[PDB]
Design a protein around this ligand. Sequence first.
Ligand SMILES: N=C(N)NCCCC(=O)O
Ligand SMILES: [Ca+2]
Length: 223
Amino acid sequence: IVGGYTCGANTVPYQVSLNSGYHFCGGSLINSQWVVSAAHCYKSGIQVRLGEDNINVVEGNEQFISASKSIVHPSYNSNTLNNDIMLIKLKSAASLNSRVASISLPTSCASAGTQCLISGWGNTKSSGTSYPDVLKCLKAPILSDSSCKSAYPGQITSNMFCAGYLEGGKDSCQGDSGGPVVCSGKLQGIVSWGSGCAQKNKPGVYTKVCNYVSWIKQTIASN
Ligand SMILES: N=C(N)NCCCC(=O)O
Ligand SMILES: [Ca+2]
């Protein structure tokens, strides 16, 4: 997260870190045994780390649970990043509490102008490189589909939206991949792609989660 702020320990209780020896992606806890992330975060040997603030220090609220299975969206295209969404099932149910909690799926899509909370452990620099240990947060509005399409000609599908600031300075970044965009208590987005971070006229692009709720629910019901 570039140009954001320190969230505060466990203030984003649905935020997960996906770990394969090291943090490599974010994710969102959606019930006691399932996490939503980006398909571009797919790999084998994932351990889901819940209740994290400082990802390099055991602080006392963590739950580490290995993934039993991952399900990349059936129509995920890694070249275009269309349908950039994946479900991860935990080997055991997380113990839900005030600091480890699921985030509600939307029943309605969000409109341009609505304010959202974007979070992660990604790069905090737009030019250089610095990775934070504690969770970073950014409040950002959803941008109009027309401004999103104008920013990235030929690249924005109906399964994507832009959020952030066309003036630059404030954005998600490398390592925030797969993490949440939460608006009015609903998971509306997944950190998907961009062109660098926090650059003028190049806001972050996010998977449009409301398009996938039916798939998420039916997948959970049979797995
Ligand atoms: N680039 C932005 N704005 N956000 C992060 C997307 C994932 C990435 O670039 O590695
Ligand atoms: Ca920790």
